[PDB]
Amino acid sequence: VADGTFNSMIMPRAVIANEREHFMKTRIDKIEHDLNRSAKQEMMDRQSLAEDYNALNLAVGQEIKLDIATQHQLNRLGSAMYKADHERETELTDLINRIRENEVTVNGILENQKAITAAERADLLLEVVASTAKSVSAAGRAAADGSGVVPVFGPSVANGIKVGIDIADSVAEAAIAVKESGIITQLNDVYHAFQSVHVAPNDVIKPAAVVAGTSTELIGNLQAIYSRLRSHSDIGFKKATVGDVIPNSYMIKPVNSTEYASWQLYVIHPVQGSLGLVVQLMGDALTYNVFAQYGNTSASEFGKTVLTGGATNTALEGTKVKFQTKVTAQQALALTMALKDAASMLSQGELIGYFEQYINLALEPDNLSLQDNMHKYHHLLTSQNSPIDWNYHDEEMHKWLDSRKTTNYDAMQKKDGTVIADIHIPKVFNDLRNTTLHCKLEGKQTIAGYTVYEYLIGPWAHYGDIDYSVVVDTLNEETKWYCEVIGIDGHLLIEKSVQHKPEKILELTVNDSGVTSFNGRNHDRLKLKVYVKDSLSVKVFRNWIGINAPRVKTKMFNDHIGVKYDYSHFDKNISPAHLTLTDLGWHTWDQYNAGNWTNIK
Amino acid sequence: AYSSGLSQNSIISLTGNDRTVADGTFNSMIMPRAVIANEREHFMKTRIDKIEHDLNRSAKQEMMDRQSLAEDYNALNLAVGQEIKLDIATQHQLNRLGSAMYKADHERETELTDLINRIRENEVTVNGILENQKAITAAERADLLLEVVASTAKSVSAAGRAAADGSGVVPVFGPSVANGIKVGIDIADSVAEAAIAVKESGIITQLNDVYHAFQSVHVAPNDVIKPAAVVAGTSTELIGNLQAIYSRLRSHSDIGFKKATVGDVIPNSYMIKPVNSTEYASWQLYVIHPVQGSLGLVVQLMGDALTYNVFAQYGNTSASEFGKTVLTGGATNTALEGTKVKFQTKVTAQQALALTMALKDAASMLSQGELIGYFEQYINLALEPDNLSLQDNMHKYHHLLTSQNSPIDWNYHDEEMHKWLDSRKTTNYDAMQKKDGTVIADIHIPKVFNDLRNTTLHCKLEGKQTIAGYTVYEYLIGPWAHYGDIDYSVVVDTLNEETKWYCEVIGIDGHLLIEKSVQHKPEKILELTVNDSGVTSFNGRNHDRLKLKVYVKDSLSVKVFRNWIGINAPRVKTKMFNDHIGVKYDYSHFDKNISPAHLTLTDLGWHTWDQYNAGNWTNIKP
Amino acid sequence: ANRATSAFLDNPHPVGVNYVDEGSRQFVAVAELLASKLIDSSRESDESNSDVPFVQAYSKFADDNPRHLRVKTGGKMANALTNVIRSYYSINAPAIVPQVEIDRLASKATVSGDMYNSYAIFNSVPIVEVLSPARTTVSIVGSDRADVTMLNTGAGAANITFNFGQIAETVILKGSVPFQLARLNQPMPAARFTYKLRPLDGPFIVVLPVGNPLVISATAATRIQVPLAFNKALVESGFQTAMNDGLFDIQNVNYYSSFDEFIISQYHAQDGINRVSTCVILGLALQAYDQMRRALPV
Amino acid sequence: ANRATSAFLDNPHPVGVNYVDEGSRQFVAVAELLASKLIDSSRESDESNSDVPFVQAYSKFADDNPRHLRVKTGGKMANALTNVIRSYYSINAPAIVPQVEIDRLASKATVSGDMYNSYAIFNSVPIVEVLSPARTTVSIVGSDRADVTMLNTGAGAANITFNFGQIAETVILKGSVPFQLARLNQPMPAARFTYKLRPLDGPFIVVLPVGNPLVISATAATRIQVPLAFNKALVESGFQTAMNDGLFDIQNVNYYSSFDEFIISQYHAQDGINRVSTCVILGLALQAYDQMRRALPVR
């Protein structure tokens, strides 16, 4: 028997309603963002980035000037979001590689052991594949987190930027220069209500391996989940692009809450996603409604409802407490379904505490039955038999946002000049993967004095022509830096010596299916590795030949199963200090000897 | 024993009529906690402040920047009696606290001018809000106000204020800046120059103790706007209440710095709790010694009764840390026996007094645990109480304690606290002169350091606005708490070998555009003489504050040095609400900018606004 | 400012002051009792296929045996009842019935003349005044259910003050869209569809947002002391019959659509209590008139 | 798309759950029967020279003989009826009358407790929702006769959806000018003044031409089972008296202009079948209250 004191000490706590519990969280996220990204560093490096972008030969109407305040603010938000998303894809590709190496042991684990929990199955799989990260708990994920994967903090980016510059009936060059230095009040409000979320491959493996019975199914589920996440992130950047103020999540609680008759209302507005969630907790009954963030022609923020789980009254009267979600709409829906099923055997405190902790801190509940049901529902919502047809909603969100961009610009072009509207609503900042962007690569591998910077080429959500370039800054006055692009048939080595200037390496064309033809073979992604002595910064730039390249349909489970691409060749490296002239070119693996990918032999 | 008579709203408690919360309910999850008594919370809350301090201000950077700062101070050709030397360890330490403390206070004033500027722009609609929405909570009334003015940092909640906070306004963490400094070296009656150099490298034990018990408090305008709107007939009265609050805050900030330089140890705020607390028989005692204040507070909680005493922080020189009680709310026992827990307050004396008045008037409705949690959260975390009715009550008491009809007056107490402080500086200097000598005494108790505004201090500027390649650094000249002659110098350091950097000073009418090219060394820019009312005549008009903007190319840092011609300039009587509405100035032109890239030779100098057309405040009308 | 009023509350004409003594009240009560018995006898006469029950009832009422060649007007009682109805309405209508005739007819039955021993609820909603600011249009339509349409064309929200008088006991307001209402110097509450108010509280302020028009439906209820024999359905029918029969055609008189409006308007006027006392007696007279005329059409 | 709703149909408050057993139903019926006899006895005594009929009637009702210099309240039966009325209206109202007292009073007269003997027709028109496009505006005014004003400011004709629920049996639509109305996926007929609808047929689409506003007047009839003694005129009068007397003054309850609106609102909520049964018993109680208070007025 127990006194009951330990049970109350491990009960979940409300992290949204408690004002002490909201202040503490907000501080840590702000501290985490400032440590990894400093406002002083980004502002000081503005000039270097501006010259890099201009040095890329971009046709008129398709080039970006970071001399404009709005263009600069959009770029740092874009670069931070892209870097975190890009890092996750490299982690996923590595994880897929380890699973494919040990498919025999993975298949045995998926078949023999099915009575264990989702977390236990994931831990066994991670140990077998010998992945870099072997912890599925929340603390382990936080501990093994890179600098770039830290979510971007809205108010930190928008801090100390001039707002509301007024010039009256002036077309002079100086007045234009002072106008461009400031930013509009709308963009400041958007940045104050913006927070990003980037889920880890370790968090995704639990939904992926909860019903899988084969390694191919487990790999396909992982790819299918991450295809949805990247599409949602692309929507998130586009939302800030148009001239509209984004809605931000809030909780409604009674003004004077009673002990025995208390109700809570949660309205989740995921900035990275096409759908929102409304959850109501009255008594022991939980009711949810999934609405569409597009449309909303009326004053009400909610659009049409696409999934019903009861009657939710959003017109309740009470105090309003505001928060930013650290989970996607799929994850929030997955938990609210499991909570609804298990509402009978959980208390009021457990229901509120489990819900608030997951939405605000991405903390999975400690209940084992609750966790298993949550991941089973998460798999269903991201599979082909989902109650929500995602491809329809993400497509409709894209059309709605482009329509808003056109009417917002045309509304301004009437109120002020074309030049004023252009500097306030750029047309070159459409979508996260559509836009021209840069990736500040980091490197921790040194082979014979050469630092290795890795980069993942693709996958592509748009089709057309793409260009890739590198900018290398090195302390030495004269250096020789090499770029190696690895495919399936072989790798391509190039040598350059120019410094402090962008240089195009690869010209690539991608078709409707999102697959390029790299030297006679269909590829879905490539690996780019850069070797430099004593480098200080290496940046990779990407741009599409045409502005606003058309979209490529998102791939579901059956699309990933149909085509299989080998990624094992991304692991091998080369030693530039031992390179020779005859070894510099496009060569295949049958030319090289076993283990030495540096000399042709 | 004080009967304010102020109208107070009824408070509905979360605990109910039983005055105790039900286990495992929504109410028990949202109840306030005690962040001071609990060691896990208090040990943590120290860690976050330390991380916040070291993130924004690095000790290694501040050690490195010492040499360049000393050279800049030397190049400011001060008189032989007012020279500041940073090779002295004690002087360098006092500069670090002074520079950090002044920068936070300067940033607060910059935001206050912007908010005042925004309010005046929308005067018509702000008036409509004030008269029409007479019956509404202060937080709700404010939320409407910041929404209609279209100003930055709209959120009024604690989380919103923390999120939209600059890097410079972070409170200074005392123990961090006192790390790794040698203390207590002895020369053993040796007067040789080598021994004197050793003695100047360290500091005395007292200064280390002062630093370990220091913590600055800086009040944001968005929190200040709530007590101003509780009684606001018109927009002008709203502006006047804003100025009255911040003038008092600036007065208290100077007093806080003076306490460090006087030569005595600052007492620590602490809480006394029973050795073994018994349910329904516990008592809490809080003693608050605000470093940035002229008065202290002692709050005692015995059962369901709350008793407080406001005591003078000056004149307690007889075996006690408490002076005479200037305001009595009951009986407080400071001889209670129990464990001793120390904390640092993040709220000013008026704020803490404002809450304890509301808590006393709502003691019957609230529970004992609610009183403890709401008090501890505000005092230690600056977290306003969640109870909206209680919060609205506290802002009503905040207004009364700041307005002219306050039960306690602050001009009298601030003047005495100044007299007590400089008298103790003379006594400590005289005693140390006898004991160890004049040379050593000058090392440990510098004469040049008097106040935050009196002392010659430097303020680094961070710039984020770029106009055609020229970064803009803004420094607000004034307002001043002293009269005399003041000087301002601008230091510019860029990566280029040759530089072309400009300055611009905005007054009520017209602006003065200048150009300088000397870099890596101080450059003297502007001269002022301010009269007994704190008002300066700039180009024929009466002003209280001016705007200074520096334009540079590829800049790394820009520093502004200020100094008074005479050491220890006299203090102007602290301004109030009545004298702030008596005369009306304009700061709308402070947002005007110029484009140095398109500047010609003929535009420099002092030009009034009418010499330009609408917009284009850089090129002259031909 | 602009003020709006309910149509039926404007300019109530003075009521008669003649037949209000104890004897007159007895005569009206006797007429109500005897007329009710007459209409019951006519129904019984039809059911039994015999005129005997009707003859007995008519003789008691008319003080004369009915004759086939005659027209069956009702006798002296019908003539006296018609003349008192004329006198009650207006002060200019002459009193032509001698007091000796009233006393003789009052002795036909033994009834108390107590006109204040019961109560009846009346549904006419009094809107004494609605004051609106500039650039706002307010129209009031209705007596049993008052619909108030307000349109705001100004820059900001307007404050419209409602005054429902001090007489009505309760008033229930329902709006097309949720709105906020409160008394003078009380905090405005959240938007709410339906409000229940006591008119004695004071003027009520309605905040009118800028946009689509807001329509408020007003229903009231007031209590008026009446005799226990009062029946509202019969009085309303009698009022229409008297108006149609030209009993209220006097110069300098105001006309009303229902007896509910007549008594309420006469109550929101100078000497309202005394005016209502005469109106109640008129209502009982109209109750007898309705019964007697339906039994003996003319 | 905008939505428009009837004011009286919103947020029906829960009704009481006590005093709804067979013994309690007998008490209300007995109170109604004894209250009617009290009225006839008072009229009989007033028309005669003796007070004996009123003395016997009041003694049966109040359990004490009438007395001069006394207020003639009504006795224990009056108190039980008043507190029972409070309980039925709201679930927050206390239930203080003992069941033994209710059973004792129900034995004074012999009547069945049948609350389902017959039926009554209630005229409140339920407009659950009106769905209109973005260019148009719709205003719903009225409870007994609902007038919906329809204005089309757009370029072309609009289609507006009328939903009358599933409870009402017939709804008659009459327009200011001839208009068109038809069911979903049905051809539009020729423009005609009046339409007869069965609300169970489905949502109804009305074409709104661009030009002058169109006003549609709707009247509906609903059938609710009631005891044979039910009298609508007496119930409505008793409803206003109880509201005036403060019997309905309790926290968190909606208020209605008439008993017709009250019963229809509870009918359209969830568990409406269960709620109307309690409302009918409250209706019979209000009938007794009107007779008893008009016979014995109190301050």
Short mmCIF file of C-alpha atoms in Angstrom, two decimals, chain C:
data_model
loop_
_atom_site.label_atom_id
_atom_site.label_comp_id
_atom_site.label_asym_id
_atom_site.label_seq_id
_atom_site.Cartn_x
_atom_site.Cartn_y
_atom_site.Cartn_z
CA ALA C 1 -30.35 63.84 -30.24
CA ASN C 2 -33.45 62.16 -31.67
CA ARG C 3 -36.31 60.73 -29.60
CA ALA C 4 -38.75 57.97 -30.56
CA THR C 5 -42.00 56.96 -28.88
CA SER C 6 -44.61 54.24 -29.11
CA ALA C 7 -47.59 55.43 -31.13
CA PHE C 8 -50.30 54.38 -28.67
CA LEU C 9 -48.82 56.22 -25.67
CA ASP C 10 -49.26 59.68 -27.21
CA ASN C 11 -51.95 62.07 -25.95
CA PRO C 12 -54.40 59.98 -23.87
CA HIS C 13 -57.77 61.70 -23.81
CA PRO C 14 -59.49 62.23 -20.44
CA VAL C 15 -61.91 59.51 -19.38
CA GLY C 16 -65.40 60.03 -18.00
CA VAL C 17 -66.02 60.83 -14.34
CA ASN C 18 -69.75 60.24 -13.95
CA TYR C 19 -70.70 56.62 -13.14
CA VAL C 20 -68.12 55.67 -10.51
CA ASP C 21 -70.15 55.58 -7.29
CA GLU C 22 -71.00 52.42 -5.37
CA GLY C 23 -74.40 52.11 -7.03
CA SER C 24 -73.01 52.44 -10.55
CA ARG C 25 -70.39 49.75 -9.92
CA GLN C 26 -73.17 47.47 -8.69
CA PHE C 27 -75.15 48.06 -11.88
CA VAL C 28 -72.22 47.10 -14.11
CA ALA C 29 -71.60 43.94 -12.09
CA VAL C 30 -75.30 43.03 -12.27
CA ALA C 31 -75.29 43.51 -16.04
CA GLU C 32 -72.29 41.19 -16.42
CA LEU C 33 -73.96 38.48 -14.33
CA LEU C 34 -77.34 38.73 -16.05
CA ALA C 35 -75.88 38.90 -19.57
CA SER C 36 -73.81 35.77 -18.93
CA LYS C 37 -76.94 33.91 -17.82
CA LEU C 38 -78.74 35.14 -20.94
CA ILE C 39 -76.09 33.71 -23.27
CA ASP C 40 -76.17 30.45 -21.32
CA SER C 41 -79.95 30.28 -21.68
CA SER C 42 -79.75 30.82 -25.45
CA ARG C 43 -77.38 27.86 -25.77
CA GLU C 44 -79.70 25.74 -23.62
CA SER C 45 -82.70 26.89 -25.66
CA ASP C 46 -81.09 25.68 -28.89
CA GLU C 47 -80.14 22.31 -27.40
CA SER C 48 -83.62 21.59 -26.01
CA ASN C 49 -85.58 22.93 -29.02
CA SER C 50 -87.66 25.12 -26.70
CA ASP C 51 -87.73 28.87 -26.15
CA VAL C 52 -88.81 28.61 -22.49
CA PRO C 53 -85.32 28.98 -20.91
CA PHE C 54 -84.55 32.01 -23.09
CA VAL C 55 -87.84 33.72 -22.24
CA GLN C 56 -87.13 33.48 -18.51
CA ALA C 57 -83.62 34.88 -18.95
CA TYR C 58 -84.80 37.71 -21.19
CA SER C 59 -87.59 38.73 -18.80
CA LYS C 60 -85.09 39.05 -15.95
CA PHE C 61 -82.70 41.06 -18.12
CA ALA C 62 -85.19 43.24 -20.02
CA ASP C 63 -87.99 43.60 -17.43
CA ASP C 64 -90.47 42.67 -20.16
CA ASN C 65 -91.63 39.47 -21.82
CA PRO C 66 -90.22 38.99 -25.34
CA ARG C 67 -92.68 39.46 -28.19
CA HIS C 68 -92.33 37.95 -31.66
CA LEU C 69 -93.29 41.12 -33.53
CA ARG C 70 -90.84 43.24 -31.52
CA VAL C 71 -87.10 43.30 -32.17
CA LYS C 72 -85.69 42.16 -28.78
CA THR C 73 -83.27 45.01 -28.13
CA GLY C 74 -82.76 44.17 -24.44
CA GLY C 75 -85.07 46.61 -22.69
CA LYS C 76 -83.98 49.39 -20.36
CA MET C 77 -80.88 47.48 -19.27
CA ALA C 78 -79.46 47.45 -22.81
CA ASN C 79 -80.10 51.17 -23.26
CA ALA C 80 -78.54 52.03 -19.90
CA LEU C 81 -75.53 49.81 -20.61
CA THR C 82 -74.97 51.50 -23.97
CA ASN C 83 -75.05 55.00 -22.47
CA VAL C 84 -72.62 54.28 -19.63
CA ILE C 85 -70.10 52.90 -22.14
CA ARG C 86 -70.28 56.19 -24.04
CA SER C 87 -69.80 58.21 -20.85
CA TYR C 88 -66.85 56.14 -19.63
CA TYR C 89 -64.77 56.72 -22.76
CA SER C 90 -64.62 60.52 -22.83
CA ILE C 91 -65.44 63.43 -20.54
CA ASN C 92 -67.32 65.21 -23.36
CA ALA C 93 -69.88 62.41 -23.70
CA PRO C 94 -73.02 63.41 -21.77
CA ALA C 95 -74.49 61.34 -18.96
CA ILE C 96 -78.14 60.80 -19.91
CA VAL C 97 -79.07 57.88 -17.62
CA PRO C 98 -80.78 59.03 -14.40
CA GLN C 99 -79.47 57.73 -11.10
CA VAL C 100 -82.92 56.34 -10.26
CA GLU C 101 -82.67 54.07 -13.31
CA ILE C 102 -79.23 52.83 -12.26
CA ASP C 103 -80.39 51.97 -8.73
CA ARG C 104 -83.47 50.11 -9.97
CA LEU C 105 -81.42 47.96 -12.36
CA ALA C 106 -78.81 47.34 -9.66
CA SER C 107 -81.40 45.58 -7.48
CA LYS C 108 -82.11 42.79 -9.98
CA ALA C 109 -79.32 40.67 -8.48
CA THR C 110 -77.19 40.70 -5.32
CA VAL C 111 -73.53 41.16 -6.26
CA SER C 112 -70.65 43.06 -4.70
CA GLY C 113 -69.26 46.01 -6.61
CA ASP C 114 -65.69 45.21 -5.58
CA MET C 115 -63.62 46.00 -8.68
CA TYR C 116 -60.21 45.58 -7.00
CA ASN C 117 -60.34 42.02 -5.63
CA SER C 118 -58.37 40.34 -8.45
CA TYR C 119 -55.81 41.01 -11.17
CA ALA C 120 -55.08 40.62 -14.87
CA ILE C 121 -51.83 40.71 -16.87
CA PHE C 122 -51.72 43.12 -19.82
CA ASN C 123 -49.24 42.65 -22.65
CA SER C 124 -48.85 46.13 -24.17
CA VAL C 125 -45.17 47.13 -24.02
CA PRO C 126 -44.61 50.79 -23.05
CA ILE C 127 -41.62 52.50 -24.65
CA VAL C 128 -41.75 56.02 -23.23
CA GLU C 129 -38.70 57.27 -25.13
CA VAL C 130 -35.72 55.99 -27.11
CA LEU C 131 -32.93 58.56 -27.42
CA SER C 132 -30.31 58.02 -30.11
CA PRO C 133 -27.22 59.98 -31.19
CA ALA C 134 -26.66 61.54 -34.59
CA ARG C 135 -26.22 59.36 -37.68
CA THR C 136 -28.43 56.64 -36.18
CA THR C 137 -31.94 55.71 -37.30
CA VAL C 138 -34.38 54.17 -34.80
CA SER C 139 -37.90 53.03 -35.69
CA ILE C 140 -40.44 51.52 -33.29
CA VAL C 141 -43.17 49.25 -34.68
CA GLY C 142 -45.71 47.27 -32.68
CA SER C 143 -47.86 47.35 -29.55
CA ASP C 144 -48.18 43.74 -28.39
CA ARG C 145 -44.64 43.00 -29.64
CA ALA C 146 -42.48 46.09 -30.14
CA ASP C 147 -39.73 45.71 -32.74
CA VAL C 148 -37.05 48.41 -32.55
CA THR C 149 -34.80 48.64 -35.62
CA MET C 150 -31.51 50.51 -35.17
CA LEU C 151 -28.99 51.28 -37.91
CA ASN C 152 -25.58 52.81 -37.21
CA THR C 153 -23.94 54.92 -39.92
CA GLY C 154 -21.40 56.70 -37.72
CA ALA C 155 -17.70 56.07 -37.32
CA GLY C 156 -17.91 54.15 -34.04
CA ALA C 157 -20.38 52.34 -31.82
CA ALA C 158 -23.35 54.28 -30.48
CA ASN C 159 -25.09 54.22 -27.10
CA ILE C 160 -28.89 54.07 -27.32
CA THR C 161 -30.84 54.68 -24.11
CA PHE C 162 -34.17 52.90 -23.58
CA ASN C 163 -36.83 54.14 -21.16
CA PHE C 164 -39.66 51.67 -20.52
CA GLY C 165 -41.45 53.73 -17.88
CA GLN C 166 -42.04 52.98 -14.23
CA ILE C 167 -45.34 51.10 -14.54
CA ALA C 168 -44.52 47.83 -16.31
CA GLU C 169 -43.54 44.95 -14.05
CA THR C 170 -41.23 43.02 -16.40
CA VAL C 171 -39.83 43.47 -19.91
CA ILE C 172 -38.12 40.80 -22.01
CA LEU C 173 -35.90 41.88 -24.91
CA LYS C 174 -34.74 39.50 -27.64
CA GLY C 175 -32.49 40.60 -30.48
CA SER C 176 -31.89 39.30 -33.98
CA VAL C 177 -28.16 39.14 -33.18
CA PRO C 178 -26.48 39.13 -29.76
CA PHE C 179 -26.08 42.56 -28.19
CA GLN C 180 -24.97 44.12 -24.91
CA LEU C 181 -27.28 46.03 -22.58
CA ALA C 182 -26.75 47.51 -19.13
CA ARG C 183 -28.08 50.16 -16.79
CA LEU C 184 -26.66 53.64 -16.25
CA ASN C 185 -23.02 53.31 -15.07
CA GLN C 186 -22.90 49.50 -14.85
CA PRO C 187 -20.25 47.45 -16.71
CA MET C 188 -21.46 46.21 -20.07
CA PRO C 189 -21.73 42.40 -20.17
CA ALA C 190 -20.97 40.01 -23.01
CA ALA C 191 -23.22 39.74 -26.05
CA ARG C 192 -26.38 37.85 -25.14
CA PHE C 193 -29.58 37.13 -27.04
CA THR C 194 -32.26 37.69 -24.38
CA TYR C 195 -32.51 40.11 -21.46
CA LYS C 196 -35.05 40.24 -18.63
CA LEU C 197 -35.43 43.67 -17.05
CA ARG C 198 -37.43 45.42 -14.35
CA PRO C 199 -38.40 48.87 -15.69
CA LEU C 200 -38.10 50.50 -12.25
CA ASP C 201 -34.32 49.95 -12.37
CA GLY C 202 -33.77 52.89 -14.70
CA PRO C 203 -32.77 53.80 -18.25
CA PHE C 204 -30.97 51.02 -20.11
CA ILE C 205 -28.09 51.60 -22.53
CA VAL C 206 -27.71 49.49 -25.68
CA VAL C 207 -24.35 49.58 -27.45
CA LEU C 208 -24.91 49.55 -31.21
CA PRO C 209 -21.94 48.34 -33.28
CA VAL C 210 -21.33 49.64 -36.79
CA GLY C 211 -22.61 47.33 -39.51
CA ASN C 212 -25.75 45.30 -40.09
CA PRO C 213 -28.92 46.59 -38.40
CA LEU C 214 -29.95 45.29 -34.99
CA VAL C 215 -33.63 44.61 -34.26
CA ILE C 216 -34.85 44.20 -30.67
CA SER C 217 -38.20 42.58 -29.91
CA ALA C 218 -39.83 43.88 -26.73
CA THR C 219 -42.48 42.06 -24.70
CA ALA C 220 -43.85 43.43 -21.42
CA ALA C 221 -46.35 42.45 -18.75
CA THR C 222 -48.14 44.67 -16.23
CA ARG C 223 -50.62 43.89 -13.47
CA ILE C 224 -53.88 45.81 -13.11
CA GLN C 225 -56.41 45.23 -10.33
CA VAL C 226 -59.73 44.02 -11.76
CA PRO C 227 -62.87 42.29 -10.50
CA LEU C 228 -62.82 38.51 -10.26
CA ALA C 229 -65.40 38.21 -13.07
CA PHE C 230 -63.00 39.88 -15.53
CA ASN C 231 -62.31 37.84 -18.66
CA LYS C 232 -59.78 39.33 -21.07
CA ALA C 233 -61.05 37.42 -24.11
CA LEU C 234 -64.57 38.78 -23.65
CA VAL C 235 -63.38 42.35 -23.04
CA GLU C 236 -61.33 42.41 -26.25
CA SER C 237 -64.32 41.17 -28.26
CA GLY C 238 -66.55 43.75 -26.59
CA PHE C 239 -64.11 46.56 -27.37
CA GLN C 240 -64.20 45.82 -31.10
CA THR C 241 -68.00 45.56 -31.07
CA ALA C 242 -68.39 48.91 -29.32
CA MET C 243 -65.90 50.57 -31.67
CA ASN C 244 -67.62 49.08 -34.72
CA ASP C 245 -71.08 50.04 -33.42
CA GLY C 246 -70.07 53.69 -33.17
CA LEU C 247 -70.06 54.00 -29.39
CA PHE C 248 -66.71 55.82 -29.24
CA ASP C 249 -67.32 58.47 -31.93
CA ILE C 250 -66.78 61.65 -29.92
CA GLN C 251 -64.81 64.72 -30.95
CA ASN C 252 -61.29 65.19 -29.57
CA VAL C 253 -60.85 61.52 -28.68
CA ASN C 254 -58.02 59.10 -29.42
CA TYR C 255 -58.62 55.62 -30.81
CA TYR C 256 -56.75 52.41 -30.04
CA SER C 257 -56.45 49.01 -31.67
CA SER C 258 -57.08 47.02 -28.49
CA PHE C 259 -58.31 47.46 -24.93
CA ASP C 260 -54.82 46.51 -23.74
CA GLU C 261 -53.39 49.62 -25.39
CA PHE C 262 -56.20 51.81 -24.04
CA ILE C 263 -55.68 50.89 -20.39
CA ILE C 264 -51.87 51.00 -20.56
CA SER C 265 -51.77 54.37 -22.34
CA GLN C 266 -54.30 55.74 -19.85
CA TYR C 267 -51.97 54.45 -17.12
CA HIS C 268 -48.85 56.28 -18.37
CA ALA C 269 -50.59 59.62 -17.95
CA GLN C 270 -51.43 62.24 -15.35
CA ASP C 271 -53.68 60.79 -12.63
CA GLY C 272 -52.96 57.32 -13.97
CA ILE C 273 -54.31 55.41 -10.98
CA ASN C 274 -57.66 57.22 -11.07
CA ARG C 275 -57.86 56.86 -14.85
CA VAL C 276 -57.24 53.11 -14.66
CA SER C 277 -59.98 52.73 -12.04
CA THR C 278 -62.53 54.09 -14.52
CA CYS C 279 -61.05 51.98 -17.33
CA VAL C 280 -61.52 48.76 -15.36
CA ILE C 281 -65.20 49.56 -14.86
CA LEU C 282 -65.46 50.22 -18.59
CA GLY C 283 -63.91 46.83 -19.30
CA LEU C 284 -66.53 45.03 -17.21
CA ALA C 285 -69.19 47.03 -19.05
CA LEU C 286 -67.72 45.92 -22.37
CA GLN C 287 -67.73 42.32 -21.14
CA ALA C 288 -71.48 42.58 -20.52
CA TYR C 289 -71.95 44.34 -23.86
CA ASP C 290 -70.24 41.52 -25.75
CA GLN C 291 -72.33 38.79 -24.12
CA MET C 292 -75.62 40.67 -24.45
CA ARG C 293 -75.09 41.58 -28.10
CA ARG C 294 -74.10 38.07 -29.18
CA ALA C 295 -77.28 36.71 -27.58
CA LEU C 296 -79.44 39.52 -29.03
CA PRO C 297 -77.98 40.73 -32.34
CA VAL C 298 -79.32 44.02 -33.67
#
